[PDB]
């Protein structure tokens, strides 16, 4: 629930999510869609 | 890999086990191409894959061939210098008649 979450801290949650997607494995927030 | 579990994580495992996902993909597909072949016919079906095109495989299978083709070159160096073939199982391509 990143909407009810502070601003300066939720950015540190995306950067760990976005650090998986660069590998291929899906993530928590930044997900993939079928081709 | 087990000694470090006491640190490594999933996204860290991918790089550790990225190479043994290939050797375990040639060998796991080398035993299906030669299923019913026995004798020399098997040493001829593990040679059809030697030319994988890439140097990471053309240099793996070309080693298993150097072991599988050792018994074949054992009959040959026996049937050439001594002329005494002996194989209860029919493997050598020279078949005698009692």
């Amino acid at each position: 629930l990143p909407g009810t979450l502070p601003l300066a801290s939720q950015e540190s949650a995306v950067v760990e999510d976005l650090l998986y997607v660069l590998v291929g494995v899906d993530g928590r927030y930044v997900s993939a869609q079928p081709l | 890999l087990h000694s470090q579990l006491q640190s490594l994580t999933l996204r860290r495992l991918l790089v550790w086990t990225y190479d043994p996902k290939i050797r375990l993909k040639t060998l796991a597909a080398l035993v299906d191409h030669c299923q019913g072949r026995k004798g020399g016919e098997l040493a001829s079906a593990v040679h059809a894959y030697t030319k994988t095109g890439d140097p990471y495989m053309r240099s793996l299978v070309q080693h298993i061939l150097s072991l599988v083709s050792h018994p074949v070159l054992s009959f040959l160096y026996r049937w050439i210098y001594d002329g005494e073939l002996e194989d209860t199982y029919h493997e050598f391509f020279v078949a005698s008649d009692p």
Side-chain angles (χ1 to χ4, degrees), chain A, chain B residues 20 28-29 36 39-40 43 45 48 53 55 71 83 95 98:
Chain A
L1 299 170
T4 82
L5 205 151
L7 266 62
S9 88
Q10 67 90 30
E11 158 182 331
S12 159
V14 163
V15 71
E16 84 166 3
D17 216 336
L18 188 58
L19 200 50
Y20 283 163
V21 180
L22 308 199
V23 194
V25 50
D26 299 333
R28 308 191 40 85
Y29 305 107
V30 176
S31 158
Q33 294 191 18
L35 192 151

